[PDB]
Design an enzyme around this catalytic site. Structure first.
Site, short mmCIF file in Angstrom:
data_model
loop_
_atom_site.label_atom_id
_atom_site.label_comp_id
_atom_site.label_asym_id
_atom_site.label_seq_id
_atom_site.Cartn_x
_atom_site.Cartn_y
_atom_site.Cartn_z
N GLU A 1 -7.47 -12.50 3.56
CA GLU A 1 -7.20 -14.29 3.80
C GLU A 1 -6.45 -14.37 2.20
O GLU A 1 -5.75 -14.17 2.14
CB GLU A 1 -7.78 -15.22 3.95
CG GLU A 1 -8.66 -15.15 5.36
CD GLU A 1 -7.80 -15.06 6.43
OE1 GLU A 1 -6.78 -15.51 6.44
OE2 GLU A 1 -9.00 -15.15 7.37
N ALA A 2 -7.16 -13.76 1.19
CA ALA A 2 -6.11 -13.90 0.05
C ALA A 2 -5.21 -13.49 -0.29
O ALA A 2 -3.76 -13.02 -0.38
CB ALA A 2 -6.90 -13.84 -1.36
#
Lengths: 70, 283, 67, 70, 70, 70
Positions: free
Chosen positions: B167-168
Site C-alpha cells: 500500500e505504501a
C-alpha cells in the site's frame, strides 16, 4: 432581484423539509423539493448559482435560481 | 526480481520503495516532477511476481531476516509470504496461478482479501496501529506460522506488512505517514479512514489519472485532489489501465466539469435522480 | 421543428416551478418536472441538446447527445 | 445540536422504511425519502455531513443535515 | 426478446412524457418514468444496456431493460 | 439473513416495475421505489452492497440493503 451569486458554500436539509444554501456569505432557504438534488449537484460540481428573490435579506426564502458553469 | 525493503530508518525505507517503483513502473508524462511521479506499472505477463526481502526491523541489524513477501507485479497484490529459514511459501487461495521455484509451496484455504483478513485477524484496518515493535511482533508471528489456514496473529501480521509495503508503494501518502514510526522516537502510525479509502479506490484512481492534463482538480468517488502537489503527495504507483480493477462499468474514464476532472461514473451516480417531489411522494 | 441545438449555456429553476435553459443564444422553458434533472445533467456533462417543438416559448421534447 | 460530523461510513435502508447512516462512529436514521439520494450522493462523493438534531442519542432519528464538500 | 444490446447512441424526452433511446441503431421508447434518469446516466457513462421487448423493430416500446457492466 | 455481499454485476428494470440486482452470483428483486436510483448508483461506483432477506435463494425479494465503501 439577484440576491447572491457564487458557488454554494454549504447546503442543509431542514426539519421542515426546506433546504438552505449559503452563497456569497448569505443564506437562503427554499421549500421547492425539486431544488434539493439540483442544488446538491451544483454544489458538488462548483456551479455558479444566482439566487433570485423579491427579498434578498440573508435568511429569506427563494424559489428561483440560475445555474451556470465556468 | 528481488528487492529489499529496509525498515532501519526513514531514509532506508523510502529509498527501498523508490528503487522498487523505478524498476517496475514508468512515470506519467503529465504527473512528474524531478524523479517523483505518479507511475504506471509496466506490463508484465499474468502470474509475474517480484520478491520483497524484509530487512532492518532491528535498525541496521542482520536479524529478523527470514521473511520474504511474494508480490504479483501487475497489481501489487501480496500473493503470500516465504519463511526463508524453512524454505516455505505460504500462498493465499486466490493466487494458485503464482508459482515460485525452489520453495515448498503451502496452498492455503484462506484468501487474501481485506474482508477475510480483517475477519480472521479480528482487526479493522481503519484505526489499525503499526509500530516498529508491532512489525517485529508481526515478523515473529509469520515465522511461527505453520499449516494451510491463516491464524489470527498471522492475519494481523499480514495486514500490517501489506500496509507498509504494497500500500505504501501505491500511495506516497501512506509512505509519508507510516515512515514516522521508524524514527528514533518510535511513534505509532495509525491508519486513518482516508488512508483506507485510498486503498479501496486504487483501481478507480488508476483509470482516471492517465487522463489528467493539468485540470484544477481531480474527483474520483470519495477522493479529491486540488492541485498537482496533492496528487504527487498522495499517489505514487497506479495500475496499467491499457487490468480488471480499472473498469467498473461503462467505457468513459472521465468528464471535465468546470475545470475539474471527474471519474464519469461518480458524476453519473449523482445525476441519475428523478424529480425529487415525484421520488419522495411515489412510495 | 428543431428549435435549437447546442450546449446549455445556463439553466434556471423558476418561481412557477418551470425550468428554463438557454441553447444557442435562445431561451426556452418546460413545465415537465422530470426534465429538470435531465437538463441539468446535460448541462453539467456537456451534452448537445436539441430542443424540439411544434412552434419554436415552451417545449416538452428534447434530444440528448454526448459531445 | 451537532450530533456527528464526518464522511458517511455506510448507509442502509431497512425493511421498516428507515434509512441509517454511520458518521464518526455513530449511527442515526431518517425516514425522509428526500434525504436518501442526498445522503447517498454525499457518501459516494466524500462530502462532510453534519447530522443535526435536538437530541443526539445513539440510534435516534434526524431530519436536519448539513452538506460540505470538505 | 432481447432486441438490442449496446451503448445508448442518443436519448430523447417525448411530448407524451415517454422516453426514447437509440441502441444498436434502433430506437425504442418507454413509458416507465423511473427509467428516464437511469437511462440518461447509463448514456453519459457509456454503460451497455439490453433493451427487452415483444417487438424489436425500430420504433418499438419497452418496459424492461438490463444495465450491464460490459 | 445476510444473503449476498458484493458488487452489483447487473441491474434490471422489470415489467412489474420491480428492480433486480445480481450480487455474488444470485439475483434479487425489490419493489421498494426508493432503492432504484440508489442501487444504480452503487452499480456505477462499484459499491459493495449487502442484501438481507428472509430467503436467500436466487429469485428472492428484498427490502433491506446496506451500501458500503469497502
Amino acid at each position: 432581484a439577484d440576491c447572491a451569486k457564487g458557488k454554494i458554500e454549504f447546503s442543509k436539509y431542514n426539519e421542515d423539509d426546506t433546504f438552505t444554501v449559503k452563497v456569497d456569505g448569505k443564506e437562503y432557504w427554499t421549500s421547492r423539493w425539486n431544488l434539493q438534488p439540483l442544488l446538491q449537484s451544483a454544489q458538488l460540481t462548483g456551479m455558479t448559482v444566482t439566487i433570485k428573490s423579491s427579498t434578498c435579506e440573508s435568511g429569506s426564502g427563494f424559489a428561483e435560481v440560475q445555474f451556470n458553469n465556468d | 526480481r528481488e528487492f529489499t525493503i529496509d525498515f532501519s530508518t526513514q531514509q532506508s525505507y523510502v529509498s527501498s520503495l523508490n528503487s522498487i517503483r523505478t524498476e517496475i513502473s514508468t512515470p506519467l508524462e503529465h504527473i512528474s516532477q524531478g524523479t517523483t511521479s505518479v507511475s504506471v506499472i509496466n506490463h508484465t505477463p499474468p502470474g509475474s511476481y517480484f520478491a520483497v526481502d524484509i530487512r532492518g526491523l532491528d535498525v541496521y541489524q542482520a536479524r529478523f531476516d527470514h521473511l520474504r513477501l511474494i508480490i504479483e507485479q501487475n497489481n501489487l497484490y501480496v500473493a503470500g509470504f516465504v519463511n526463508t529459514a524453512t524454505n516455505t511459501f505460504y500462498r493465499f487461495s486466490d493466487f494458485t496461478h503464482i508459482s515460485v521455484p525452489g520453495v515448498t509451496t503451502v496452498s492455503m484455504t484462506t484468501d487474501s482479501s481485506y474482508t477475510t483478513l480483517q475477519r480472521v485477524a479480528a482487526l479493522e484496518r481503519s484505526g489499525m496501529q503499526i509500530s516498529r515493535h508491532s512489525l517485529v511482533s508481526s515478523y515473529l508471528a509469520l515465522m511461527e506460522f505453520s499449516g494451510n489456514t491463516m491464524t489470527r496473529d498471522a492475519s494481523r501480521a499480514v495486514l500490517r506488512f501489506v500496509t507498509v509495503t504494497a500500500e505504501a508503494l501505491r500511495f506516497r501518502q501512506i509512505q509519508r505517514e507510516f515512515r514516522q514510526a521508524l524514527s528514533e522516537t518510535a511513534p505509532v502510525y495509525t491508519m486513518t479512514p482516508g488512508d483506507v479509502d485510498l486503498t479501496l479506490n486504487w483501481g478507480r484512481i488508476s483509470n482516471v489519472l492517465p487522463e489528467y492534463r493539468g485540470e484544477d482538480g481531480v474527483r474520483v468517488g470519495r477522493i479529491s485532489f486540488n492541485n498537482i502537489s496533492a496528487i504527487l503527495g498522495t499517489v505514487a504507483v497506479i495500475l496499467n489501465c491499457h487490468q480488471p480493477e480499472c473498469q467498473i462499468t461503462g467505457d468513459r474514464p472521465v468528464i471535465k466539469i468546470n475545470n475539474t476532472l471527474w471519474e464519469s461514473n461518480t458524476a453519473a451516480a449523482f445525476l441519475n435522480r428523478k424529480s425529487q417531489f415525484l421520488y419522495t411522494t411515489g412510495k
